[PDB]
């Protein structure tokens, strides 16, 4: 009936003066836009049908055409920034916002999905959706005693759309919008659906990606523990975003960082630092480096959990990118750690795997490592031990790589290395 229509036909119908003809034609257009086989978004946009659809949104008297056009507009808005721009230019934002209140759950759900695609385009449309005031209508849809009573899919679209209202930066979402949304977001980070949980974490990970004041309004809601918990989840789709949020939170003040330490975070890393998925590792190691860059009592917490051996492990064999984060973790640690602690690090075998990395073709890491070395040597000369440290690095061929680097092209490199040699070698 309404399958495979030509854009030509779809136009004929939408332009006719028969509501039904139009509805039939709109359902037809919807189907075209709902195929994976590269759907005719541009042709439909070219036919000049968006303003027509946008108009059908208001046909309160004919719910089906509202739905059909809503779905059509949704897939067009799911395209390129330009395709999404087309929808916005058509006057759809306020229209879709009106449909949030639609008595037809399936129509408002489409309005939620559409505003989701629009806001997802970026800051500008995100803030435009916000200026038309979509947050209240949205948040209103989740104003129930028990979330479980809502339709599983209906709840996932809302969580996802809110997720995009938090997404992006430069500029970051409006502060009062974040504060308005956070309460509801927290209630979602406690729902049983693994999908709501994942998008919720993405939402929180976004919000925590920025200035410390931002991380604070999130940490201030006491979600950290709930995150550390989700950090132990089985479903990678949840663990990935949860680890990202925790990772961000520790890029803030030592007080905020302490929160995850108290939350129990550190206890989940032996697993995270040996995780089969490299990115979980890459991000877990990065997270570790931001913790080893904090207080000494916080460096102690890392030590007490027996994570130093894990870092040694990552520093030894892992993806290069993971090893670079390890390099930092180790370099940050030796940066603010006590002598006693920098001693432990070497007693764990950090020296050998550290030298071997002085072979990679990445001037920056070669820096970070040498950097860590002088740090270590420094704590050594406080124990006169230096010579042992020398012997040691010489034992595993580190001296060769250093005295070699001494003749590197980067100015800083050959300089730090050259000094190491004279001041501590051969």
């Amino acid at each position: 009936g309404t399958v495979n229509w030509s854009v030509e036909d779809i136009v004929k119908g939408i332009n006719s003066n028969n509501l039904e003809s139009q509805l039939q034609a709109t359902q037809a257009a919807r189907k075209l836009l709902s195929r994976e086989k590269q759907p005719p978004i541009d042709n439909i946009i070219r036919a000049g049908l968006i303003p027509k659809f946008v108009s059908f949104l208001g046909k309160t008297d004919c719910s089906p055409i509202q739905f059909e056009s809503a779905w059509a507009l949704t897939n067009i808005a799911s395209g390129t920034s330009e395709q999404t721009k087309a929808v916005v230019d058509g006057g759809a934002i306020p229209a879709f916002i009106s449909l949030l209140a639609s008595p037809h759950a399936h129509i408002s759900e489409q309005a939620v999905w559409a505003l989701g695609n629009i806001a997802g385009d970026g800051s500008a449309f995100r803030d435009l959706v916000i200026k038309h005031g979509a947050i209240d209508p949205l948040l209103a849809l989740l104003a129930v005693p028990d979330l479980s009573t809502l339709a599983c899919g209906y709840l996932r679209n809302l969580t996802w759309t809110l997720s995009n209202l938090c997404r992006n930066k430069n500029p970051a979402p409006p502060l009062d919008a974040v504060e308005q949304i956070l309460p509801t977001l927290v209630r979602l980070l406690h729902h049983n659906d693994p999908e709501v949980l994942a998008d919720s974490c993405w939402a929180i990970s976004y919000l925590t990606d920025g200035p410390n004041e931002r991380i604070e309004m999130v940490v201030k809601k006491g979600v950290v523990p709930q995150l550390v918990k989700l950090l132990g989840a089985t479903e990678l789709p949840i663990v990935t975003p949860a680890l990202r949020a925790i990772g961000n939170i520790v890029t803030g003040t030592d007080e905020q960082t302490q929160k995850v330490i108290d939350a129990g975070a550190l206890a989940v890393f032996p697993s995270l630092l040996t995780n089969p998925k490299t990115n979980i590792q890459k991000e877990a190691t990065w997270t570790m480096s931001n913790i080893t860059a904090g207080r000494q009592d916080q460096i102690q917490q890392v030590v007490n959990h027996g994570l130093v051996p894990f870092l040694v492990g990552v520093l030894s064999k892992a993806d290069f990118k993971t090893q670079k984060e390890a390099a930092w973790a180790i370099t940050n640690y030796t940066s603010g750690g006590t002598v006693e602690q920098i001693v432990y690090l070497v007693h764990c075998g950090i020296i050998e795997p550290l030298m071997n990395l002085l072979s990679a073709k990445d001037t920056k890491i070669i820096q970070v490592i040498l950097d860590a070395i002088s740090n270590i040597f420094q704590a050594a000369e406080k124990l006169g031990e230096t010579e042992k440290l020398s012997i040691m690095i010489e034992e595993c061929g580190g001296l060769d790589k250093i005295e070699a680097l001494q003749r590197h092209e980067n100015e800083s490199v050959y300089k730090a290395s050259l000094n190491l040699i004279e001041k501590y070698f051969s």
Binding site: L33, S34, E36, W71, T74, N75, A77, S78, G79, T84, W113, G116, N117, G120, D121, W160, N164, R167, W202, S205, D209, P241, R244, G247, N248, T251, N279, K282, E283, W286, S289, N290, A293, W328, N332
Partner: peptide, 16 residues
């Protein structure tokens, strides 16, 4: 002390 970019996050938009 230092944060970076992403392993693409973002399915910004969803179809049908």
């Amino acid at each position: 002390k230092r944060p970076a970019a992403t392993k693409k996050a973002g399915q910004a938009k969803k179809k049908k």
